[PDB]
């Protein structure tokens, strides 16, 4: 969303289109393509624009009985117009003038995935049908032996691996031989099916989840959260009480530093701005983490910069935005910033790994069916 | 279709200034604050009418394969007929 | 004159005394060679190259005594501002042509809108390319298969489980019970009471889907992500994202490097290229062997020759700054226009693909 | 129109606007058995 | 060698008790060898030219 | 392998590339792609260069 | 590559713009907008290169 640096020590100066600012007050390089969007804005706006550093507190928020922060800095009226992208906040909105969206945003917590047996319907219809034809051939044996023959051809049902003397009945079995042959083809076929085209999930349920709506109710802690004075988290103060409750263990510092915690993964995910989220997607070390859910909308909103309540450029400033989306060059703003790096906004990549207990689920599904056969065997004893 | 084209949204028509203007905008803000949005998805959007594929999860494949499998069943009935005719062939051939 | 470039030429010191090793081709011809004095890093040295060959056939069109020189500095040439008198000055081969130190320049350099007001040249001696040197990442994917990537715990777990199922079989029995090593486990390997027979079908489909699982494992062994190579395009984000994570650049004082040196959007990029620049394209192949940077950039077709040089490197995406090669032309030349004609005839004849036989057409990897 | 040495010899020809070449392109309507070494060693 | 293709040889398995598992060596071995067959089946099954 | 054909297969693309999408960018009578008369986004077309 | 060459337009032998015209080309590839010329024409449709 925002870039900065030191001015060029050789020349002691800014580069690119960058307009720097002082730091107390010492000039330091101020950068970033959204601020740039503000620049191209001021262009047709023709409004003298001189950068400043932020004093403290990242964005603005209520402090004690008052507010202290960027928005608060605006409330201080120490500046004509704001710089930096902070979410539209109804509270902050009620405070003073907020601009129109420069870009959309939302609440999100994104993470990584470090399978549901579907290999294991009407196939069974073909099975019982094959039992019917099995009866037919059992009749064909006229001109255990007939009864367990169902188990004989049924041997093919898995790779044969268990024969009647019927000469015509032999080819009658051969029916099940080619049939079950292509049925093995069906098995390896579904093996291709799951073998290709997987999806899975980390199953994010949103603000509320098993791991969220009843987070303490599970065995491990699943930590999804943000840093001090989270704006979207301020919405979470409204969203859920247990949220801000568990937020204590969820305590974390730094944004990119939080991404580092993701590299550690000591927490479930990191609640943050969905815009900032996707940002965290594009810039990364490699492909590990994934969006909060798919990036499904959670607390639809946007961030941006603004000016004092009832300011000069206000309407016309919004019009400047109207130009901004007008030319379509905002696409080129992605090209300046939001353009995709990690990409992968759709494809599921590869889950390739060995088998796991998830694979073992079907194994259990048969192993218990054995016990079912034991109960029915006691019924045979009855 | 592919991706975003001309990002935009919806709202309430406002002419000049409105007695309900700014506070109405506030109402929108509160709307974003509350879940009435996702609730509106419940009104319409959230309803999932159809699936979304990429590949062809046909792993069932069954009713499609019914011609080949049931075709094998045709081989079985053919087993009845040809086994009866051939049954007379070898049986009466020994006679 | 030129600089030794394995894509362009094979140039090494002379053999013993004024000696050049005589060797036929891989196709068996003993292609000609030449010699040029120069420094090795001012001494007599040897000259051989498919480019140099194009000089050979070139004079073979218009007779002229072939003289071969080296390049004092490393670069090709560039208009350059001095520390005094404030005059932009083409350098090197360009400069040496302004110096006229040789008849006509020969090298695989691009016609530059820069070089325009400086010098002229004919149509391309070949259609060439320039892009970012791409380094191949190490694929592995190897496995011991059902050994390696199959159910680390469950490989044995389901097995001893099957031993327990065998205990259920012997239960159905109550040796024949002791025969379960053959019956149930033999069912597993498929290696050769009507109530329990159902359980027969049970361990049966069980192993069926098990082998199936091994098949899925094969799919893992083949199909797999092996994630992308980056290297997107002129807009490539990795290149477009200033940081210290990755290193992508080209050598100092190069023609395409100038294609960066006059730019708008590339600003931060070429800025990085300042601290990231290198000297020799050979030094680029070297730093690649070292995997020194994250990435490099040079003449693209040349980099295809580098693909012939080593497998540790990759082919970049697509065309960047389409250009080509030719003969150095200062003002007008007595050999100028007819020389261009010679190029034309070169396109007409197969001497091009023949030059591929000299170098390009060789498939190394 | 392609740079043609003949036509080139005729009169002034510009520099390349774009590259070109001789080609004849086609389709494949409907593989070399490779399913069928050290495996045999095993 | 019957296993070399899917077993399927009617003829007279040997009676060796230890030799049985000795065959089982070829049973798991050739099992994953079938895995090798279907594996190459994936190979050509993917990535053609 | 036949099963692999039954699963893996090309099923070629959907076109619909982007604002630069060639099919849309290539005037002809082959394909028909448009929006309704007198619309807002239609106006987003009505003021344009490319 | 088969018969590497190019097409285009030109003028009479020894014409006015000649050198400078070539320079105009030098601009043409200069800005890189020839990429945008593909976008005007040569841009890929069938892709699948």
Short mmCIF file of N, CA and C in Angstrom, two decimals, chain C residues 1-5 8 38-41 69-78 91-96 106-109 251-257 278-283:
data_model
loop_
_atom_site.label_atom_id
_atom_site.label_comp_id
_atom_site.label_asym_id
_atom_site.label_seq_id
_atom_site.Cartn_x
_atom_site.Cartn_y
_atom_site.Cartn_z
N UNK C 1 37.27 -6.15 -35.32
CA UNK C 1 37.55 -6.56 -33.95
C UNK C 1 36.24 -6.90 -33.26
N UNK C 2 36.34 -7.62 -32.16
CA UNK C 2 35.19 -7.99 -31.34
C UNK C 2 35.72 -8.55 -30.02
N UNK C 3 34.82 -9.05 -29.19
CA UNK C 3 35.16 -9.71 -27.94
C UNK C 3 34.76 -11.18 -28.07
N UNK C 4 35.62 -12.06 -27.57
CA UNK C 4 35.35 -13.48 -27.68
C UNK C 4 34.04 -13.81 -26.99
N UNK C 5 33.12 -14.40 -27.74
CA UNK C 5 31.85 -14.87 -27.18
C UNK C 5 31.55 -16.23 -27.78
N UNK C 8 29.13 -16.13 -30.21
CA UNK C 8 29.60 -15.45 -31.41
C UNK C 8 30.80 -16.15 -32.02
N UNK C 38 45.87 -9.33 -29.13
CA UNK C 38 45.10 -8.66 -28.11
C UNK C 38 45.44 -9.08 -26.69
N UNK C 39 44.94 -8.32 -25.72
CA UNK C 39 45.14 -8.70 -24.32
C UNK C 39 44.21 -9.83 -23.92
N UNK C 40 44.67 -10.61 -22.94
CA UNK C 40 43.92 -11.74 -22.42
C UNK C 40 43.63 -11.49 -20.95
N UNK C 41 42.36 -11.30 -20.62
CA UNK C 41 41.96 -11.06 -19.24
C UNK C 41 40.47 -11.33 -19.05
N UNK C 69 41.37 -7.80 -35.44
CA UNK C 69 41.80 -7.07 -34.27
C UNK C 69 40.97 -7.52 -33.07
N UNK C 70 41.43 -7.15 -31.89
CA UNK C 70 40.70 -7.42 -30.67
C UNK C 70 40.06 -6.14 -30.17
N UNK C 71 39.35 -6.26 -29.06
CA UNK C 71 38.72 -5.12 -28.39
C UNK C 71 39.56 -4.76 -27.18
N UNK C 72 40.05 -3.52 -27.14
CA UNK C 72 40.80 -3.05 -25.99
C UNK C 72 39.97 -3.18 -24.72
N UNK C 73 38.93 -2.37 -24.61
CA UNK C 73 38.01 -2.48 -23.49
C UNK C 73 37.08 -3.67 -23.70
N UNK C 74 36.20 -3.90 -22.73
CA UNK C 74 35.29 -5.02 -22.81
C UNK C 74 33.99 -4.74 -23.53
N UNK C 75 33.51 -3.50 -23.48
CA UNK C 75 32.16 -3.21 -23.93
C UNK C 75 32.06 -3.28 -25.45
N UNK C 76 30.86 -3.05 -25.96
CA UNK C 76 30.69 -2.92 -27.41
C UNK C 76 30.97 -1.48 -27.83
N UNK C 77 30.04 -0.58 -27.54
CA UNK C 77 30.30 0.85 -27.59
C UNK C 77 29.15 1.66 -27.05
N UNK C 78 29.41 2.86 -26.52
CA UNK C 78 28.32 3.70 -26.03
C UNK C 78 28.72 5.16 -26.10
N UNK C 91 31.99 4.91 -27.45
CA UNK C 91 33.17 4.27 -26.88
C UNK C 91 33.46 2.97 -27.60
N UNK C 92 34.66 2.44 -27.33
CA UNK C 92 34.97 1.08 -27.73
C UNK C 92 34.85 0.86 -29.23
N UNK C 93 34.28 -0.29 -29.59
CA UNK C 93 34.09 -0.61 -31.01
C UNK C 93 33.43 0.55 -31.73
N UNK C 94 32.39 1.12 -31.13
CA UNK C 94 31.86 2.37 -31.64
C UNK C 94 32.96 3.42 -31.69
N UNK C 95 33.60 3.68 -30.55
CA UNK C 95 34.66 4.67 -30.53
C UNK C 95 35.79 4.32 -31.47
N UNK C 96 36.25 3.07 -31.42
CA UNK C 96 37.32 2.64 -32.31
C UNK C 96 36.95 2.86 -33.76
N UNK C 106 32.91 -5.73 -36.77
CA UNK C 106 32.20 -6.99 -36.88
C UNK C 106 31.92 -7.49 -35.47
N UNK C 107 30.64 -7.70 -35.16
CA UNK C 107 30.21 -8.15 -33.84
C UNK C 107 28.71 -8.36 -33.79
N UNK C 108 28.24 -9.11 -32.89
CA UNK C 108 26.80 -9.34 -32.77
C UNK C 108 26.13 -8.30 -31.87
N UNK C 109 26.15 -7.05 -32.31
CA UNK C 109 25.57 -5.96 -31.55
C UNK C 109 24.35 -5.42 -32.27
N UNK C 251 25.42 -6.78 -17.46
CA UNK C 251 26.78 -6.32 -17.24
C UNK C 251 26.86 -4.81 -17.43
N UNK C 252 27.93 -4.23 -16.89
CA UNK C 252 28.15 -2.80 -17.03
C UNK C 252 28.51 -2.44 -18.47
N UNK C 253 27.97 -1.31 -18.94
CA UNK C 253 28.31 -0.72 -20.23
C UNK C 253 28.04 -1.71 -21.38
N UNK C 254 26.75 -1.96 -21.60
CA UNK C 254 26.30 -2.82 -22.68
C UNK C 254 25.24 -2.10 -23.50
N UNK C 255 25.00 -2.61 -24.71
CA UNK C 255 24.04 -1.97 -25.60
C UNK C 255 22.63 -2.07 -25.04
N UNK C 256 22.17 -3.29 -24.79
CA UNK C 256 20.86 -3.45 -24.16
C UNK C 256 20.87 -2.79 -22.80
N UNK C 257 22.00 -2.85 -22.11
CA UNK C 257 22.13 -2.09 -20.87
C UNK C 257 21.77 -0.64 -21.11
N UNK C 278 27.68 -6.27 -13.98
CA UNK C 278 28.85 -7.13 -14.09
C UNK C 278 29.74 -6.67 -15.24
N UNK C 279 30.78 -7.43 -15.54
CA UNK C 279 31.71 -7.03 -16.59
C UNK C 279 31.55 -7.90 -17.82
N UNK C 280 32.04 -9.13 -17.77
CA UNK C 280 32.04 -10.01 -18.92
C UNK C 280 30.75 -10.80 -18.98
N UNK C 281 30.26 -11.03 -20.20
CA UNK C 281 29.18 -11.99 -20.38
C UNK C 281 29.66 -13.38 -19.99
N UNK C 282 30.93 -13.68 -20.28
CA UNK C 282 31.54 -14.87 -19.71
C UNK C 282 31.45 -14.83 -18.19
N UNK C 283 31.73 -13.67 -17.60
CA UNK C 283 31.53 -13.52 -16.16
C UNK C 283 30.08 -13.72 -15.78
#
